[PDB]
Motif scaffolding. Structure first.
Motif: not given
Ligand SMILES: CC[C@@H](Nc1ncnc2[nH]ccc12)C(C)(C)O
Length: 167
Positions: A46-47, A158, A155
């Motif tokens: 993830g992040v 999203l 996303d």
């Molecule tokens: C915290 C959940 C989120 N993930 C991320 N959001 C922003 N930048 C990112 N970079 C790598 C992953 C990521 C999501 C809504 C896509 O599920």
């Protein structure tokens, strides 16, 4: 005035954008980037995995020393560490991971950590691989954070759903 660009304004203090938080951090170099951490500061996916990869694993090395000294964080808690090449500081915040059975009520406690910082670049806590409803995470963010938060997200599909459903 700050250097964040292209955000939609949701409220007095909350802003949102479809963006890769790694690329956003590298461009803005904000004072604070928020990591979607776990209590062990094991930045695998993830992040957290993405931020750590962008630091060439320096975030993980620093985090392992932090845990060896201090022990794990609490769910809902945080710590301030270096932002490495991405930001001045990284605020590692532990939202509940629903895929571990953790109490979603702790999401508000997690967002309260943001109020200790005047401006932050952040992901939606407990979203993505942490298994919570992102619409709920955005609602808790707006209803809890009073400081200026710039939400990145990853996303595109999203993001559009979050904007269109925002109350
Ligand atoms: C915290 C959940 C989120 N993930 C991320 N959001 C922003 N930048 C990112 N970079 C790598 C992953 C990521 C999501 C809504 C896509 O599920």
């Amino acid at each position: 005035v700050n250097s964040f660009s292209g955000y939609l304004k949701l409220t007095d203090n909350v802003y949102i954008k479809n963006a890769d938080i790694v690329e956003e951090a590298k461009k803005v170099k904000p004072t604070v980037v928020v990591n979607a951490a776990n209590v062990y500061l094991k930045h695998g996916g993830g992040v957290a995995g993405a931020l750590n990869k962008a630091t060439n694993n320096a975030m993980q090395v620093e985090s392992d020393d932090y845990i060896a000294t201090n022990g794990p964080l609490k769910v809902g808690g945080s710590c301030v560490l270096s932002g490495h090449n991405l930001a001045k500081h990284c605020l590692h915040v532990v939202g509940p991971n629903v895929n571990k059975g953790e109490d979603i009520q702790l999401l508000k406690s997690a967002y309260e950590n943001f109020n200790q910082h005047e401006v932050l670049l952040a992901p939606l806590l407990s979203a993505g691989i942490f298994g919570a409803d992102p619409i709920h995470s955005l609602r808790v963010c707006v209803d809890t954070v009073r400081t200026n938060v710039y939400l990145a997200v990853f996303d595109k599909n999203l993001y559009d759903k979050l904007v269109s459903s925002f109350l």
